[PDB]
């Protein structure tokens, strides 16, 4: 019932989380929290909804259903369906005139251009501490930035009914050791953008 | 008095804190706390003892003393004098051969190489957020640094100068805040004026 709904909705950015399976072998709440947080806070990157400030997660809750939240707030419920989820997360979002997010991933603060050039971006993926860029267009009609909290670097490839949920970006993450190299920060972006290119 | 003796502690560091009289003026309690709070920041800065990651403080007591404090913890007091002071502080501390502080000054984190490039370092200003570098040798036998907290620059300027309980003025920090903590042209600027600083005092 509700394992499946989630799985339904997951389907929606491509994840496949095997809820459904995961209950069906016993396994116990946490696991089954673990995995549906897991995979919720894949399935943000894939929407493009534009809520990297936000932590998100989901839970059984004690009548059958899925709680998702946003921040720790009780945002939605599964059960509701897209259209209820959509509305909970309609005014959180800030969206510009291409339909991408208008909000910084890592928070307020300074964010640097998105048309660096490489020289000086390897500066950054080298030696800066948590930073992010603002949206460039890039190739093949997509739109990238990156950002860096603690030790991932998040590489970002976005092409945007107010309920309907779709594929609508990619992030690949590096990290680690891998958070701060350059020409593995180039690779990523050629990953995500192949990645998106197949879902659209 | 103990306005006095704070104002002699800030003289090592070569801070003319002025205490003594703000306390002639009748100044309130809050607006003197404030006042050596302020000072005994700056003389964080000169001493050169390398806790830049620690939050200093100053207050009056009940009972006629100044408390220092480190992270919101009573350090020392004023009254019992430097060698308590200094005692008070080294636990904390961690120096290298030169003398100079390991600590980061933001605390856990990543901090580039001492002898970054300019032009590199330069990137950091305009467009990172935090950062920061490890020491590099400079001109004359000091050497210095760079970090980013928030919307100040600091820039540090170091030559370490002894008895354990001495203090003296082994450093000076040049700021720069708001749009001027994001402007590349200014770091040479503040560097070359922290040197001359330090010139001075030594």
Redesign the interface.
């Known amino acids: 019932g509700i394992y499946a709904a989630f799985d339904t909705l997951m389907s929606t950015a491509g994840v496949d989380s095997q809820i459904a399976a995961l209950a069906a072998s016993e396994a116990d709440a946490g696991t089954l929290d673990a995995a549906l947080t897991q995979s919720l806070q894949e399935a943000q990157g894939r929407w493009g909804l534009g809520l990297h400030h936000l932590r998100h997660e989901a839970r059984l809750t004690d009548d059958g259903d899925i709680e998702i939240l946003t921040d720790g707030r009780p945002s939605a419920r599964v059960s509701e369906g897209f259209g209820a989820l959509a509305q909970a997360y309609a005014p959180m979002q800030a969206l510009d005139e291409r339909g991408l997010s208008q909000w910084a991933a890592?928070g307020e603060?300074?964010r640097?251009?998105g048309d660096?050039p490489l020289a000086?971006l390897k500066?950054?993926i080298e030696?800066?501490?948590?930073?992010?860029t603002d949206w460039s267009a890039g190739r093949g009609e997509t739109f990238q930035r990156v950002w860096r909290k603690g030790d991932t670097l998040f590489v970002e490839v976005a092409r945007p009914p107010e309920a309907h949920f779709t594929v609508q970006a990619f992030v690949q993450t590096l990290s680690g050791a891998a958070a701060?190299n350059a020409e593995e920060y180039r690779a990523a972006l050629k990953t995500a953008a192949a990645a998106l290119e197949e879902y659209q």
Do not use: I, N, S, T
């Open positions: 890592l603060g300074y640097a251009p660096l000086q500066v950054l030696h800066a501490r948590d930073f992010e701060r």
